[PDB]
């Protein structure tokens, strides 16, 4: 049919070609017999007939007159459907300006003529004249003349000189423009001028002129002459109940425009005075402006109720526009909706539909089978029989509903598992029964939520629902390798209560020959479910190549585990149920069942776990009483100790030792420590305090308190909720993220005061107002993440390269948060990995390492695997299967032709939204850690201190004087095992090389107020610190000691902003001291809030504190407050203080001194040395005048900006930095996201690449073009005798890179529809319909999944 969409400007000849008539009167339906008016916005002569195959006046009535045009009213008799296809047009008496090319910012008229926007809007809205054809005078071709100046110009130069005004003047300016001469003149100016800002402006105007001269467009078409009208059927005036009509916005706007045009034409026909026609031209221009894009001008007009009405742009742009409301998503027939109930008698491939919903859903199917069997005769007879709900219809419904899967769907569909396909089971009632095993995936609690059903009509839809979207084949979440059908909240409790032991029973020491006799014992009640017996079991093993070899043993187990073994499929080792099965235990059990056996045994076993959990949970009676939450008898001692310590803090801050912010930072510290102590004390008292006799003296066992069962099993609960049920509730947070200074001291089991409840109200409102008002900026994240990765789809089997990111197991301050196994699993290695059996390879070059390979890598203790990443793939418009890895939902390599960009974006974007609508579940607790200020190393081994600049203290111990340090603990083998981050100004009791014993303390510091320290001792002189101007100095009269606080750049005096406080070190003679290594003075700069408690010229020791600066480490650190960081990383925001790097290698030295600020020059020893850099005096330099620096080394300190790290350290370093930071952010809240999705997003970041030099390619010098195009052009040129064009990868944010996508329809549908549509119309772009959203809008097979083969056939056919 078609394979492209072209967008360009509209010519008046082309609009008249679109035009079928000339509307010139604002007459809608005549408030009478409802006929269209003669020459109004609705008319049969202009657009088309009202009723089908009928004339307007009534001269023809049926199809036998089709084609003829009537005589009395001049209308044609044709279909009535063409009223939404046949456009009219308006012949404006005077031209007008189209605002989209006027106020886009960049204003196309503004930079096309190089005259500012203000002058153009003054000219186009009649406040000043403008000059055309200056001629033989001093007036230029673009000069602006006011009224008085224009009058002067006419009284002195009233010759053939012309000076028009308004839209006519602008039209003359654009028509009298020569594109080639301007283009070559600007090219000459670009070649001549050396300044960069004028160069950028000139090259932007050159780009615009090249866009004009390339396409068939011309500059004069941007001023509107004829105004086409929308077809009447798309602006209907529905006849309401009575004589009034609908207040359709477009009709009123067209009425106003036609009013202005007709009045202007009448005034121009009568030769009105020039001021009146000028004012009426202004009115016409503003009316057309309000019709085209209302609200872009100063005031948006309103029709009624003082409400800004919508124009032709408000229904194309925004959240309520056609792109997001009626194109990317539509209301769908054959659908239903009802409240859901449990019905746990179902299976994974079954759902429950109400008997009445299925009769309305599958109604055409019933009609078809009723016509097939001959029970009915025609369609209307079957319709009447269905409406009468005869008994035969109910019988035949069970026939159509048999194996026709439906789409169960919830309202918020966060991820891929929001739509699953089930077979229906017809039941009575009006509720959609749902299988609870998928309720965790759905996040569909049974508290009154509505799900939506959908009926696959065509054959392919049913087969896709059977083979792809079926819930049986969706038991692995796309986020990670963990299963998504995890039993929860009843089955976990049942299994945990069953698979448990206590030392007593009805029968304990007896012996059984298998699970069957254990069941016989438990059913008869001759042995308790928690006995400790020795049954004889027959577990199977598959050591052979797919054959199960038998073995029989006599293991010491319980009765419950023996019963549970009856449902375990043949092939798993018995050492999976011989414990207390919690939630993670059975999750791992299901995972290993899937990994070993497959899919059908896994689903059958999951259903069996469901059944045997529900039955033995019903039989358990695991209730909850008020006698189950036991209050520990030592929590009030802990609150007394914390009260004493905070009373000490009172004296600490009121004296002046610490300030208000520091007091607030320490009080939260001590309250959190007390809360963590009370929680642990209560947990111990509630899990171990039970007494039982084994037929003799008393023995201790794991407690059987109900709350402990449902807090240890993990069915539903954690430490927070139960901790708040007994003992200490803790300290809660305000909606802004700040934490309350006073934690309420009471628990819900004993009660709350009338004031502690008021305090907990803060956290309770925080949770709710955080969910409902900050899940918006987390749904926005996933929206603009799915947008940026929609067009990325697997396209090739193998790209065949050797490039790949370097993969290491990360230890960022604690234990091993994630090992190698959890990190590299299911990803194809990039090269032959070297085991520590060196000179021999362990795993081949291109094997997708599965769980067995992961175990092999864990066995040989390998710590450095080069793995293929999706960001380093070499394919074109997609990524090969080998650079991605496994499907993450199936146990195999991914199939070529699958949309992984969408599953990556959804996986990244819905832990944030999900968990931010979960912060109210724990109540309102801050959940802030204790902020430990010491290092207790546990493992035995040595220390490898990397990049540490330590100095000697007055006590002699090492003190760190660097910011990027990390203390790594490495065991005796030499492999890395631990790594801790020591802070600035921390003292070390140990060093490097010494084998540190396990269980000592090596580093100490103070958590708040990290101190600036000195290298060399001596006397300090108070330089550039005068009281009041830049420092607030307070002094006690009696003692006479200065404890000052410095000012910021905020509250300091405006004149004194050039005064920068610092402490300079001098000797006894006041001479200059030097840093060890260089001859530069010790100028230690002071930041804001720096407190100093010293005196000028005091004797100190080397390596001591000088000043303290508060850190203000305050925040709840939830996913609600704590994830703008992910948005900053993905949109690539430049940090406030970027740490300057070394852009080229070579020796480092200074050049000129104080060119306003410091200067530095890097010179290589072989190549050219044109690199200079500007260094503000804010940051000290970690390098000196006499070392050698390499590319990527940090000259100063601070956060890295995700532009320079890419441009200097390469793609791998920046992608690893982004991956690590996002992974740490998500793992702070326990989320487990596979890194592949993040790498997919980072690859989608890097699509733009600016050209360094043209080379032999056809691209320009500074033009920014797709990296895929550059790679293809370079590969094509390298096949010939030419040379490729050197480039550099850019890094634009997800929003920036999405808005500059090659297919303009995606960007137009996403955001800034006006600014993108105008650019696409100016440039004359041509969409290829390559991605997914474009084919969604068009309505074809998306080239993503099952339609990928069809798209390949359609592409290769041409």
């Amino acid at each position: 049919e078609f394979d492209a969409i072209k967008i360009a400007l509209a010519s008046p000849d082309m609009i008249r070609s679109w035009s079928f008539g000339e509307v010139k009167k604002p007459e809608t339906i005549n408030y009478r017999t409802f006929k269209p008016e003669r020459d109004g916005l609705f008319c049969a002569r202009i657009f088309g007939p009202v009723k089908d195959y009928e004339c307007l006046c009534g001269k023809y009535k049926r199809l036998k007159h089709r084609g003829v045009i009537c005589e009395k009213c001049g209308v044609e008799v044709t279909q009535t459907k063409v009223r939404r296809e046949r456009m009219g047009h308006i012949e404006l008496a005077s031209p007008t300006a189209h605002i989209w090319f006027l106020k886009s910012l960049p204003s196309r008229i503004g930079l096309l003529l190089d005259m500012p926007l203000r002058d153009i809007e003054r000219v186009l809205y009649f406040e000043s004249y403008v000059v055309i054809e200056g001629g033989m005078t001093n007036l230029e071709r673009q000069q602006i003349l006011t009224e008085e100046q224009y009058l002067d110009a006419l009284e002195e130069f009233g010759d053939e000189f012309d000076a028009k005004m308004g839209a006519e003047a602008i039209q003359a300016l654009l028509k009298s423009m020569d594109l080639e001469q301007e283009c070559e003149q600007l090219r000459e100016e670009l070649n001549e001028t050396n300044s960069e800002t004028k160069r950028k402006k000139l090259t932007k105007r050159i780009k615009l002129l090249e866009a004009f001269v390339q396409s068939g467009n011309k500059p004069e078409w941007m001023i509107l002459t004829v105004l086409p009208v929308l077809p009447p059927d798309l602006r209907p005036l529905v006849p309401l109940d009575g004589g009034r009509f609908a207040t359709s916005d477009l009709n009123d706007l067209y009425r106003r425009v036609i009013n202005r045009n007709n009045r202007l034409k009448r005034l121009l026909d009568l030769a009105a005075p020039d001021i009146i026609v000028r004012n009426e031209k202004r009115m016409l221009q503003e009316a057309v402006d309000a019709l085209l894009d209302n609200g872009r001008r100063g005031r948006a007009i309103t029709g009624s109720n003082k409400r800004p009405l919508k124009s032709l742009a408000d229904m194309i742009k925004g959240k309520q526009g056609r792109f997001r409301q009626n194109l990317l998503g539509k209301r769908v027939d054959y659908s239903g909706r009802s409240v859901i109930t449990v019905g746990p008698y179902l299976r994974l491939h079954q759902c429950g539909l109400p008997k009445k919903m299925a009769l309305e859903l599958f109604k055409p199917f019933i009609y078809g089978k009723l016509e097939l069997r001959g029970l009915a005769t025609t369609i209307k007879a079957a319709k009447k029989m269905v409406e009468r709900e005869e008994a035969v219809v109910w019988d035949i419904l069970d026939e159509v509903i048999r194996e026709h899967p439906v789409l169960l769907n919830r309202a918020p569909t966060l991820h891929r598992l929001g739509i699953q396909a089930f077979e229906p089971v017809l039941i009575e009632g009006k509720a959609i029964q749902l299988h609870p095993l998928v309720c965790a995936a759905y996040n569909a609690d049974f508290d009154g939520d509505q799900m939506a059903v959908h009926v696959p009509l065509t054959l392919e839809a049913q087969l896709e629902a059977r083979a792809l979207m079926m819930s049986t084949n969706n038991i692995l979440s796309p986020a990670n390798g963990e299963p998504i059908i995890v039993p929860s909240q009843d089955v976990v409790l049942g299994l945990y209560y069953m698979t448990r032991d206590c030392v007593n029973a009805k029968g304990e020491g007896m012996v059984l020959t298998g699970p069957k006799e254990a069941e016989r014992l438990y059913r008869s009640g001759l042995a308790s479910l928690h006995a400790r017996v020795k049954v004889r079991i027959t577990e199977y093993e598959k050591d052979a190549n797919g054959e199960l070899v038998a073995k029989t043993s006599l293991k010491d187990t319980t009765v419950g585990r023996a019963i549970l073994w009856m449902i375990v499929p043949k092939g798993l080792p018995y050492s999976i149920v011989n414990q207390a099965l919690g939630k993670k235990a059975i999750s791992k059990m299901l995972n290993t069942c899937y990994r070993i056996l497959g899919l059908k045994p896994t689903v059958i076993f999951a259903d069996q776990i469901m059944y045997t959990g529900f039955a033995y949970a019903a039989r358990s009676g695991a209730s909850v009483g008020i006698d189950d939450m036991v209050i520990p008898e030592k929590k009030h001692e802990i609150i007394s100790e914390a009260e004493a310590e905070v009373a000490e803090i009172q004296e600490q801050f009121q004296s002046g030792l610490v300030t208000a912010g520091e007091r607030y930072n320490k009080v939260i510290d001590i309250w959190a420590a007390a809360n963590d102590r009370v929680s642990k004390a209560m947990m111990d008292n509630l899990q171990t305090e039970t007494v039982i006799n084994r037929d003799g003296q008393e023995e201790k066992q794991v407690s059987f308190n109900s709350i402990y069962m449902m807090a240890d099993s993990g069915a539903r609960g954690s430490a927070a909720q139960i901790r708040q049920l007994a003992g200490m509730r803790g300290l809660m947070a305000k909606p802004d993220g700040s934490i309350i200074e006073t934690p309420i001291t009471a628990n819900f089991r004993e009660g709350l005061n009338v004031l502690q409840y008021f305090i907990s109200t803060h956290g309770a409102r925080k949770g709710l107002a955080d969910t409902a008002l900050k899940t918006a900026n987390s749904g926005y994240l996933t929206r603009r993440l799915v947008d940026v990765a929609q067009d990325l789809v697997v396209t090739e089997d193998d790209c065949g390269t050797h490039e790949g990111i370097m993969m290491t197991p990360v230890i960022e301050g604690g234990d091993v948060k994630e090992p190698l196994r959890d990190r590299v699993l299911g990803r194809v290695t990039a090269e032959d990995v070297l085991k520590p059996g060196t000179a021999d390879i362990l795993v081949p070059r291109n094997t997708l390492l599965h769980e067995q390979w992961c175990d092999l890598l864990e066995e040989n203790s390998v710590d450095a695997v080069k793995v293929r990443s999706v960001v380093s793939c070499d394919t074109d418009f997609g990524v090969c299967a080998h650079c991605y890895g496994r499907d993450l939902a199936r146990g195999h390599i991914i199939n070529k032709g699958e949309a992984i960009g969408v599953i990556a974006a959804q996986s990244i974007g819905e832990p944030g939204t999900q968990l931010t609508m979960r912060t109210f579940h724990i109540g309102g607790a801050a959940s802030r850690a204790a902020a430990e200020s010491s290092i207790q190393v546990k493992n035995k081994g040595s220390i490898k201190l990397s990049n540490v600049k330590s100095v000697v203290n007055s006590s002699g111990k090492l003190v760190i004087t660097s910011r990027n340090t990390e203390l790594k603990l490495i065991d005796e083998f030499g492999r890395t095992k631990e790594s801790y981050k020591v802070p600035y100004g921390a003292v070390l009791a140990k060093g490097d090389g010494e084998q540190v014993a396990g269980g000592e303390t090596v580093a100490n510091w103070d958590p708040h107020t990290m101190p600036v320290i000195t290298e060399v001792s001596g006397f300090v002189r108070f330089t550039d610190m005068i009281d009041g101007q830049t420092i607030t100095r307070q002094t006690d009269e009696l003692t006479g000691l200065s404890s000052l606080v410095v000012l910021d750049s905020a509250e300091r005096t405006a004149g004194g902003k050039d005064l920068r406080p610092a402490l300079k070190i001098v000797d006894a003679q006041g001479n200059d001291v030097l840093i060890p290594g260089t001859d530069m003075p010790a100028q230690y700069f002071l930041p804001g809030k720096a407190i100093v408690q010293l005196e000028d010229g005091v004797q100190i020791s080397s390596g001591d504190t000088l000043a303290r600066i508060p850190q203000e480490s305050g925040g709840t650190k939830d996913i609600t407050g704590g994830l703008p960081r992910v948005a900053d990383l993905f949109e690539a925001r430049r940090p406030k203080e970027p740490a300057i790097l070394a852009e080229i290698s070579g020796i480092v030295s200074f050049g000129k001194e104080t060119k306003g600020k410091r200067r530095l020059v890097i010179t290589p020893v072989d190549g050219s040395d044109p690199y200079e850099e500007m260094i503000p005096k804010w940051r000290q330099l970690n390098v000196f005048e006499g070392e050698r620096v390499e590319r990527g080394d940090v000259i100063s300190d601070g956060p890295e900006a995700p532009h320079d790290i890419l441009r200097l350290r390469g793609v791998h370093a920046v992608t690893r930095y982004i991956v690590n930071e996002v992974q740490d952010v998500y793992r702070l809240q326990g989320v487990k996201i596979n890194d592949k999705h993040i790498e997919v997003i980072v690859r989608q970041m890097l699509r733009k690449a600016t050209i360094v030099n043209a080379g032999s390619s056809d691209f320009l010098e500074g033009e920014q073009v797709e990296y895929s195009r550059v790679k293809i052009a370079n590969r094509e040129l390298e096949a010939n005798g030419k040379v490729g064009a050197t480039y550099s990868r850019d890094l634009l944010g997800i929003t920036k890179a999405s808005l500059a996508t090659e297919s303009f329809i995606s960007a137009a549908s996403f955001q800034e529809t006006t600014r993108v549509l105008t650019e696409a119309a100016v440039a004359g772009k041509r969409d290829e319909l390559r991605g997914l959203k474009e084919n969604v809008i068009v309505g074809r097979l998306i080239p993503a999944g099952t339609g990928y083969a069809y798209h390949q056939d359609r592409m290769r056919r041409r």
Binding site: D1048, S1049, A1050, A1054
Partner: protein, 49 residues
């Protein structure tokens, strides 16, 4: 908001330097607003409606 005079702060996020401004508001029961405010250059600028 009760009619009267209100001395708002607009602390923080303005001027990208932390420089606290100070704006005085006189909200009438029925009439025009009389917003006084400062400037980053320590100028006191009035702004009505």
């Amino acid at each position: 908001r009760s009619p009267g005079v209100f001395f708002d702060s607009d602390k923080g996020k303005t001027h990208s330097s932390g420089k606290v401004l100070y704006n005085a508001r006189i909200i009438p029961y029925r009439g025009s607003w009389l917003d006084f405010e400062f400037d980053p250059k320590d100028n006191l600028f009035v702004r009505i409606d």
